[PDB]
Amino acid sequence: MLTEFDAGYGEQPFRDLCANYPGAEAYDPHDFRIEWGPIFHRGRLDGSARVLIVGQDPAQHETIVRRILVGTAGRRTQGFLAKLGIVQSYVMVNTFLYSVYGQSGGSKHKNEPGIVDYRNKWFKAVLGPGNIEAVVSLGGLADEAWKAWLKSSDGAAYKTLAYQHITHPTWPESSAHDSATQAANTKIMLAKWNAALAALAPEVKHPDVPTTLVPYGDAFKPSELVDIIAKDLPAGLPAWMRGDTPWAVRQGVDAAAKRRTIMITIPDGVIP
Amino acid sequence: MLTEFDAGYGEQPFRDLCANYPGAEAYDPHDFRIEWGPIFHRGRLDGSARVLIVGQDPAQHETIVRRILVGTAGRRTQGFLAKLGIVQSYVMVNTFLYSVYGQSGGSKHKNEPGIVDYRNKWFKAVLGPGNIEAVVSLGGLADEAWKAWLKSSDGAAYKTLAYQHITHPTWPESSAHDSATQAANTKIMLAKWNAALAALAPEVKHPDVPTTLVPYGDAFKPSELVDIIAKDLPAGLPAWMRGDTPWAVRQGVDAAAKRRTIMITIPDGVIP
Known part of the structure; x- marks a missing residue:
């Protein structure tokens, strides 16, 4: 029933780096x-x-x-x-x-x-x-x-x-x-x-994983598009955020509004 | 120039709690x-x-x-x-x-x-x-x-x-x-x-802070509405997310659409 997560930046030197950023x-x-x-x-x-x-x-x-x-x-x-x-x-x-x-x-x-x-x-x-x-x-x-x-x-x-x-x-x-x-x-x-x-x-x-190299062909194959693993994401983030369907876009009526806004739409199928 | 942050769930028992949630x-x-x-x-x-x-x-x-x-x-x-x-x-x-x-x-x-x-x-x-x-x-x-x-x-x-x-x-x-x-x-x-x-x-x-108790009046005073401190937020989140102006809403043409979407809008004044 286990789901891994990235606990993040509690250890040095990373803790101080994240508290003093440019x-x-x-x-x-x-x-x-x-x-x-x-x-x-x-x-x-x-x-x-x-x-x-x-x-x-x-x-x-x-x-x-x-x-x-x-x-x-x-x-x-x-x-x-x-x-x-x-x-x-x-x-x-x-x-x-x-x-x-x-x-x-x-x-x-x-x-x-x-x-x-x-x-x-x-x-x-x-x-x-x-x-x-x-x-x-x-x-x-x-x-x-x-x-x-x-x-x-x-x-x-x-x-x-x-x-x-x-x-x-x-x-x-x-x-x-x-x-x-x-x-x-x-x-x-x-x-x-x-x-x-x-x-x-x-x-x-x-x-x-010891793997024998399989070169790319002319186009990406679906097996060559790999979802980000649960271990890379903060605790509690839902699985669709590390899925294959786009879910965030910037949107606005003009440049200034577009810059100020992000739209998140959960992929179809997550909610029953 | 230092900004504090919450490193989160790296320590036990919180690490196992967050990896095994309902x-x-x-x-x-x-x-x-x-x-x-x-x-x-x-x-x-x-x-x-x-x-x-x-x-x-x-x-x-x-x-x-x-x-x-x-x-x-x-x-x-x-x-x-x-x-x-x-x-x-x-x-x-x-x-x-x-x-x-x-x-x-x-x-x-x-x-x-x-x-x-x-x-x-x-x-x-x-x-x-x-x-x-x-x-x-x-x-x-x-x-x-x-x-x-x-x-x-x-x-x-x-x-x-x-x-x-x-x-x-x-x-x-x-x-x-x-x-x-x-x-x-x-x-x-x-x-x-x-x-x-x-x-x-x-x-x-x-x-x-050693404090002598000062009661509420009839209405909230602006001094009584206190911004969440940086130390409570994950590393790197911008200050307006812990400010006094709303910046997220759910949006949709009906209930099902509204359930799938959150709109984030940066408050006016942050971007020059």
């Missing part, structure tokens, strides 16, 4: 959705993580769950991990604590010290135990964040750590509206994702 | 909003609590924050506690883990063993350390819950524990639609609240 002094309040509060991570903070995922920024689903990569990109990222035999032993951190507001380029502030220094504190904490055997970045700003970590004194010890940059999971859908272009761009993505898997598989020596 | 077998899925998952408590689980509040059930604000009594009733309860010199040293649990669905009362499934036995486990855990000096129940079902706890084997030790039943904080607005009657019933409520405070003040010997 606000408007580091993250521009127009260019970042700092209004929703920071979302810190997803996964293992007990030292059992074997793979580190560096993502870009949280969206509206993360804003309700209070953990990162729990939307469509997370489920695609989960399936990527499953092919390495990694089912629960991961930890995930984002480039930015808050959502980027606008396709106006999120690089504007990519080198702000308040942002970079705090993030590096999180890198140090999760890498500290020395149990991470591989690191994967999602998209370009993620790649630059990891490289900026490596140029720091504490990061220089990790230039040797197995690392792969892959294309951000929702790139096909952000690149185009048309279905035909989306599928072609998906095919391109999965080819690149397969190359990362080939480089990473020999390097993931401690899988949760 | 679902549909105890809480009827039509008569309870089990679809949102359980909301367990608000306040101190480290044993430093001096006052226990027993409430009735969570609503849509509690459903987002994942702690109880964070709406209007919560801000009125905080002010009641403040008049005893209690600012953070409280613990709060509800009669039911889930919202009662329907005006057809909470009274219908109140004797469900699955419901009562699990709640009694929470009473046992928070009272365990032995530092609670006073108990306040909000409304009748809470009152029945506390008394039924006392008749249990583990509850019998607490019959001498100072106890007051008080009118549930949102009774005035629930009793009538009109301004004059709501005001008349508010005046009636606060006189009874004054009576409980007088009985409780001598028994709260370790207040957070």
Whole structure:
């Protein structure tokens, strides 16, 4: 009758990190959705993580769950991990604590010290135990964040750590509206994702499940879209929040109203 | 620049309690909003609590924050506690883990063993350390819950524990639609609240702030509506979620649609 949960941030160094987080002094309040509060991570903070995922920024689903990569990109990222035999032993951190507001380029502030220094504190904490055997970045700003970590004194010890940059999971859908272009761009993505898997598989020596690598084809198969596990979510969150159906969107009559609002709709079938 | 937060349920016995909580077998899925998952408590689980509040059930604000009594009733309860010199040293649990669905009362499934036995486990855990000096129940079902706890084997030790039943904080607005009657019933409520405070003040010997009792008038004063403290909210939740302006409602064209949806709207003034 047991349901697992992520108890979160009671242990040091994470407790102090969560109590002293950067606000408007580091993250521009127009260019970042700092209004929703920071979302810190997803996964293992007990030292059992074997793979580190560096993502870009949280969206509206993360804003309700209070953990990162729990939307469509997370489920695609989960399936990527499953092919390495990694089912629960991961930890995930984002480039930015808050959502980027606008396709106006999120690089504007990519080198702000308040942002970079705090993030590096999180890198140090999760890498500290020395149990991470591989690191994967999602998209370009993620790649630059990891490289900026490596140029720091504490990061220089990790230039040797197995690392792969892959294309951000929702790139096909952000690149185009048309279905035909989306599928072609998906095919391109999965080819690149397969190359990362080939480089990473020999390097993931401690899988949760010993698994022989099955490369992606041209499109995502449903088995390659894996729900976020119960162990990653705060106590008491319902199972549909870690299901396969979208359930949160931003909505408003104009830009200002849309920015102020999140809509949650429980998937059909949960309520009898 | 430090912001306190509630790390939650990492310690035993609360860890096992939250991993093994009652679902549909105890809480009827039509008569309870089990679809949102359980909301367990608000306040101190480290044993430093001096006052226990027993409430009735969570609503849509509690459903987002994942702690109880964070709406209007919560801000009125905080002010009641403040008049005893209690600012953070409280613990709060509800009669039911889930919202009662329907005006057809909470009274219908109140004797469900699955419901009562699990709640009694929470009473046992928070009272365990032995530092609670006073108990306040909000409304009748809470009152029945506390008394039924006392008749249990583990509850019998607490019959001498100072106890007051008080009118549930949102009774005035629930009793009538009109301004004059709501005001008349508010005046009636606060006189009874004054009576409980007088009985409780001598028994709260370790207040957070040593305080001489100042009674309610006829209406709530703005000083008596106290924002929930940051230390009660999960890491990273923005300050407006613990402010004085409502920010969540259920929305739908009919009952079934309204049951499936919660709308969150950030208060005006937070975003520049």
